[PDB]
Amino acid sequence: GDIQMTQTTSSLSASLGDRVSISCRASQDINNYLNWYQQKPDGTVKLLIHYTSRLRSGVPSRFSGSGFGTDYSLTITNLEQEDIATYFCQQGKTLPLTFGAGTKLEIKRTDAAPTVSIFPPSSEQLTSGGASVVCFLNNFYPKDINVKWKIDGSERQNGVLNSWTDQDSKDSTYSMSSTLTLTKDEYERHNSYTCEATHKTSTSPIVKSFNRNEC
Amino acid sequence: FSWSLTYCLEEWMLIAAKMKCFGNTAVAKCNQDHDSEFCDMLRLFDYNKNAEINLCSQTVNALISDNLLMKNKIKELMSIPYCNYTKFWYVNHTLTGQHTLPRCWLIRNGSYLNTSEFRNDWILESDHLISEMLSKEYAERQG
Amino acid sequence: QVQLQQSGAELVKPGASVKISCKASGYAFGSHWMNWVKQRPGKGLEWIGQIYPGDGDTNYNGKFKGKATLTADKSSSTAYMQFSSLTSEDSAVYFCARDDYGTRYYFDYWGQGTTLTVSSATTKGPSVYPLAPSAAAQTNSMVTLGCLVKGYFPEPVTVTWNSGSLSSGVHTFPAVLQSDLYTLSSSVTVPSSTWPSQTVTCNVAHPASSTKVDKKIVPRD
Amino acid sequence: GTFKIGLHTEFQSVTLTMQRLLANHSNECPSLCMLNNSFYYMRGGVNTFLIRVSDISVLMKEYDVSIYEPEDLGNCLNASDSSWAIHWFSNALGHDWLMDPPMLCRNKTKKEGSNIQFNISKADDARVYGKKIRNGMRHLFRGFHDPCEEGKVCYLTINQCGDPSSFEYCGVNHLSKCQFDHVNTLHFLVRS
Ligand SMILES: *[C@@H]1O[C@H](CO[C@@H]2O[C@@H](C)[C@@H](O)[C@@H](O)[C@@H]2O)[C@@H](O[C@@H]2O[C@H](CO)[C@@H](O[C@@H]3O[C@H](CO)[C@@H](O)[C@H](O[C@H]4O[C@H](CO)[C@@H](O)[C@H](O)[C@@H]4O)[C@@H]3O)[C@H](O)[C@H]2NC(C)=O)[C@H](O)[C@H]1NC(C)=O
Ligand SMILES: *[C@@H]1O[C@H](CO)[C@@H](O[C@@H]2O[C@H](CO)[C@@H](O[C@@H]3O[C@H](CO)[C@@H](O)[C@H](O[C@H]4O[C@H](CO)[C@@H](O)[C@H](O)[C@@H]4O)[C@@H]3O)[C@H](O)[C@H]2NC(C)=O)[C@H](O)[C@H]1NC(C)=O
Ligand SMILES: *[C@@H]1O[C@H](CO)[C@@H](O[C@@H]2O[C@H](CO)[C@@H](O[C@@H]3O[C@H](CO)[C@@H](O)[C@H](O)[C@@H]3O)[C@H](O)[C@H]2NC(C)=O)[C@H](O)[C@H]1NC(C)=O
Ligand SMILES: *[C@@H]1O[C@H](CO)[C@@H](O[C@@H]2O[C@H](CO)[C@@H](O)[C@H](O)[C@H]2NC(C)=O)[C@H](O)[C@H]1NC(C)=O
Ligand SMILES: *[C@@H]1O[C@H](CO)[C@@H](O[C@@H]2O[C@H](CO)[C@@H](O)[C@H](O)[C@H]2NC(C)=O)[C@H](O)[C@H]1NC(C)=O
Ligand SMILES: *[C@@H]1O[C@H](CO)[C@@H](O)[C@H](O)[C@H]1NC(C)=O
Ligand SMILES: *[C@@H]1O[C@H](CO)[C@@H](O)[C@H](O)[C@H]1NC(C)=O
């Protein structure tokens, strides 16, 4: 019986000065009792628009709201840097109150290929008994990327842990770390270690590798 | 179409907390149903006493003049002398006891006019009082 | 002028309870509904409930009825949310928010949030390992080095380079949790000529364990 | 206040009080009095109502209840007795249930208390209506003050004493210094 809010788009890319529209759909007619919140990357939350299109004090005029019934929309013309954030809608007709999942805005830029760097396990870690192979995929755009590990020519996915960064604020790129952790014995039982980066920028992947016996 | 009276006012109807009797010669003029705030107050007391003792009824027009109330309200809104149905002045022949019908003591901006401001009024009232005393004596002892 | 200050981060073990607080300033505490909201990564925002400090009436979301208990204190102008039988599903960020005068069901003022972590993991300091290019590697115009911070709990850790004097071309990845232990890495890029003549040293700090480690990145072989 | 005109003719006066009747107030028989140049009070027996004229509106038509008919006033007050009291007061102010703009009130289900709102702004589509509602006030409260500024917003707010929306303004320090005036009650009778 609850009221489901649906923000179909979870991520949206746009260049500064563009017109952006974020849609919000209600499972039931909510009669214009829709409110828009802005969450900055630090977790700060602020109300911007209530009752579909009523702007709050201090909200710049580039923000606007529209809709009626089940479909609504937040529009941001002349997208400014400070608008890069996540925007949630919320129905205020009936309890329980419900929010959308959110729509994160990210800055658009020209494509950039990742800069790949592979790192063998350190002697310090090998002393302790483990062996972590690290591969950095740095400063690429767009954020979609894939990493493949190969040991002695064979693909390995177990023991791999990945971590993407948020969009960098100065160059608008993304970076990613891939760490393959093995045992010392398993690491010494193999020689060739390779990470391959697949990205929109190149049909073939960027391949970086090292041989364990070549120090 | 206008209420009739029976005049003495009870002590609780007066600021002096002292029953005040007015001759019927003057109170009878209230029946004529002329523009008189004092007579409106008398009819209000008379109707709402004989009737809890509230002030309201569905026949206010038979007790008061709506035109007179409207006129006093307009005078209020013009910042000119008007009547707020409170204090009234008359002219009493202390010798005989016959008096004129009390007429309202007007106020301007929440203050009662000084007697000198409406002195023509009570001059005329006393003139008419004595004229009517003489006329009564004449028409009676004429035979 | 209107301000909502929530209590600090909490780290508790499963089955425990915890009461988070929200101090209000700048308005009549007893004239506004105080709502609570739960946020998790990828789970949007969930409405927990609301209390009216005036009469103390509480309206709960059916899903959180039994998990959450809302109280208020008008003297201190402070709302409280108490959780019982905490589980790892309860780890999240919790906001207190205020409705406008009346009851418009929109939240015009928010607190900064309170992070709750429910875990049976025990505190442990990190191990720091260097990440230097293999002896057989290209000599490009730039060189990337790194530090691997592995096996610690709880978050956070802070990584600087050369005591903060090296900040351009640096970025640290979000920690990933595996088997009750966090791992992250920090990357730093510098002109190839700069290294190894000018040394690069990562400074890792884990406050929860009062651990501070410096690790110089030395070329291999 | 009595002087002599002639040897026997004398100026005399008499002051009347209607308070014993204004104390037996009731909803159909409200006693009306003025306190501030901003606070007015209507006593209708057990129900007391504070009336204020300010530029501060706490109600919006997008969120609050619009009263198109007297029956809708039942959504505004805890009891229907008060509902019909406010119906008769609205009539007395000159409001037109068929032609004038609908007034606003807070749903009695909320926690903030009763609040009926009239938009008497001197501007746009609220100007004309506004003046009327002030005229009504001038009829119902001798010495009514017109704090409404030209071209700016102005609102008349009614709160039933007892609800949280009455704050402390319905205390004894207020109603004890609000002399009832029967002229106001006569105007209420005539205009309703
Ligand atoms: C004055 O306030 C009362 C009570 O308000 C209600 O409780 C408050 C504490 C607060 O939570 C309010 O938001 C809440 O409305 C109002 O009376 C309520 O009116 C609503 C709307 O008409 C009724 O809700 C309806 O009740 C049924 C289910 O309980 C059902 O018939 C309706 O269908 C709903 O669901 C379908 C499908 O899911 C959807 O299509 C409909 O649009 C609708 O959501 C609906 O839920 C309440 O039952 C009423 N409660 C009462 C009478 O106690 C009253 O209208 C209001 N007056 C105003 C604002 O002028
Ligand atoms: C109580 O009543 C007052 C007075 O009526 C009211 O304040 C007024 O609100 C209206 C809108 O509700 C304002 O009029 C608008 O103001 C600006 C120009 O000043 C414009 O946005 C509008 O004109 C354009 O936009 C309209 C909307 O799209 C179009 O219909 C129109 O054709 C134009 O394109 C319009 O003029 C008015 O200025 C205020 N006045 C004051 C003094 O505030 C107040 O909201 C009411 N209070 C309530 C309802 O609680
Ligand atoms: C009609 O208007 C007149 C003139 O303004 C009002 O007369 C005023 O009435 C009040 C209340 O009775 C008087 O207050 C009292 O005055 C004395 C001296 O202080 C004393 O009896 C009491 O302590 C009390 O203060 C007031 O003096 C008097 N005159 C004024 C204000 O100038 C009259 O009340 C009005 N009638 C109504 C409102 O029904
Ligand atoms: C309110 O109504 C009551 C009841 O009618 C009035 O009390 C009457 O007062 C008169 C005059 O003093 C007495 O003769 C009656 O016996 C009283 N009747 C009753 C039933 O008590 C009262 O005067 C009115 N006014 C006030 C201020 O209470
Ligand atoms: C109509 O109902 C409201 C809501 O119950 C009354 O206000 C409540 O009064 C009780 C009794 O003192 C308080 O304990 C509650 O806290 C009040 N509610 C709120 C939301 O503040 C209100 O008084 C009633 N109306 C009238 C005219 O008495
Ligand atoms: C008029 O004066 C006489 C004589 O003093 C007095 O008995 C009578 O009551 C007075 N009438 C009034 C004041 O109406
Ligand atoms: C009305 O009188 C009250 C007394 O409590 C005061 O709070 C308020 O400021 C006054 N407003 C005026 C005189 O306009």
Numbering used by the authors:
A (entry chain L): 0 to 214
B (entry chain B): 265 to 270, 281 to 325, 336 to 427
C (entry chain H): 1 to 52, 52A, 53 to 82, 82A, 82B, 82C, 83 to 100, 100A, ...
D (entry chain A): 60 to 251
Please give sentences taken from the publication describing this entry.
NW arenaviruses present a glycoprotein (GP) complex on the envelope surface of the virion, which orchestrates host cell entry and is a key target of the immune response arising from infection and immunization. Each protomer of the GP trimer consists of three non-covalently linked subcomponents: a stable signal peptide (SSP), a membrane-distal GP1 attachment glycoprotein, and a membrane-anchored GP2 glycoprotein, which are the result of proteolytic processing of a single SSP−GP1−GP2 chain in the endoplasmic reticulum. Here, we address this paucity of information through X-ray crystallographic determination of JUNV and MACV GP1−GP2 heterodimers in complex with the Fab fragments of neutralizing antibodies.
Introduction of inter-chain disulfide bonds at equivalent positions in other NW virus GP1−GP2 constructs, including MACV (at positions 88 and 340, MACV GP188-340GP2e), was similarly successful. JUNV GP188-329GP2e-JUN1 and MACV GP188-340GP2e-MAC1 complexes were crystallized and structurally elucidated to resolutions of 2.1 Å (JUNV−Fab JUN1) and 2.4 Å (MACV−Fab MAC1). JUNV and MACV GP1−GP2 are recognized by Fabs JUN1 and MAC1, respectively, at previously characterized epitopes located at their TfR1 recognition sites. The engineered GP1−GP2 disulfide bonds in JUNV GP188-329GP2e and MACV GP188-340GP2e structures are occluded within their respective GP1−GP2 interfaces, where they are shielded by the loops they connect (α1−β2 and α6−α7 in JUNV). Interestingly, however, in the JUNV GP188-329GP2e and MACV GP188-340GP2e complex structures, only a small portion of the HR1c region is helical, and JUNV Cys329 and MACV Cys340 reside within a loop that follows a helix-like trajectory. Additionally, and possibly related to this observation, the neighboring Asn83 in MACV GP1 is glycosylated and directed away from the GP2-resident fusion peptide. Although Asn83 is conserved among these viruses, only in MACV, TCRV, and Tietê virus is it part of an NXS/T (where X≠P) N-linked glycosylation sequon.
